[PDB]
Amino acid sequence: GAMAPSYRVKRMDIAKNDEECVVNAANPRGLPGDGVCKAVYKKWPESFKNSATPVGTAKTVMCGTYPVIHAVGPNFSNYTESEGDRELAAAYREVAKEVTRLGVNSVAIPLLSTGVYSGGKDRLTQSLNHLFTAMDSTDADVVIYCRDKEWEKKISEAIQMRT
Ligand SMILES: COCC(=O)Nc1ccc(O)cc1
Ligand SMILES: [Cl-]
Ligand SMILES: [Cl-]
Ligand SMILES: [Cl-]
Numbered sequence: 001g002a003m004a005p006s007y008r009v010k011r012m013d014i015a016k017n018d019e020e021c022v023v024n025a026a027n028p029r030g031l032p033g034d035g036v037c038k039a040v041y042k043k044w045p046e047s048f049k050n051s052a053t054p055v056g057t058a059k060t061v062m063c064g065t066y067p068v069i070h071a072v073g074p075n076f077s078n079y080t081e082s083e084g085d086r087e088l089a090a091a092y093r094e095v096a097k098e099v100t101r102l103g104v105n106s107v108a109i110p111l112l113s114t115g116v117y118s119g120g121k122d123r124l125t126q127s128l129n130h131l132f133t134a135m136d137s138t139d140a141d142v143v144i145y146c147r148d149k150e151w152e153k154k155i156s157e158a159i160q161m162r163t
Helices: 035-043 081-102 124-135 149-161
Strands: 007-011 022-025 058-063 066-071 106-110 141-146
Touching: 007 149, 022 035, 058 081, 066 081, 081 106, 081 124, 124 141, 124 149, 141 149
Parallel strands: 007 141, 022 066, 022 106, 106 141
Antiparallel strands: 058 066
């Protein structure tokens, strides 16, 4: 575990992370995809061998010794708000199981279902609160990656508001 487990947020490409493992915002079919998934595919393409996994689950594939945790958030275009909310919470619980199993002291994590799986809605708070619900019982340092300047501010505020 980390001596004093923390949450941080950085606004940059998660492919450039400084953590012991990464969470991919994956699709269920293990395809290169778009956004974070495409960045992950470019950086760690070896980790897409048999990475397909259902919605609401996480599947870890090693790129060398570097773990890539493929977490499949729901596409809110396809799910009802109720069912999508349940699957989004479930994907994060599976990330927390994998982070724990791996014994890492840090993890880089994007906000699941906030980009092209958002169904055109702002899901920062929904996705971040499911992240916290799952990750709060873990002792890894968590570094959340985002690209938008206003999202960085809002994630940073949410982290600071609970310290
Ligand atoms: C069951 O754990 C498998 C594993 O490889 N874990 C791991 C631990 C630390 C690290 O920095 C990278 C990976
Ligand atoms: Cl960058
Ligand atoms: Cl997304
Ligand atoms: Cl963002």
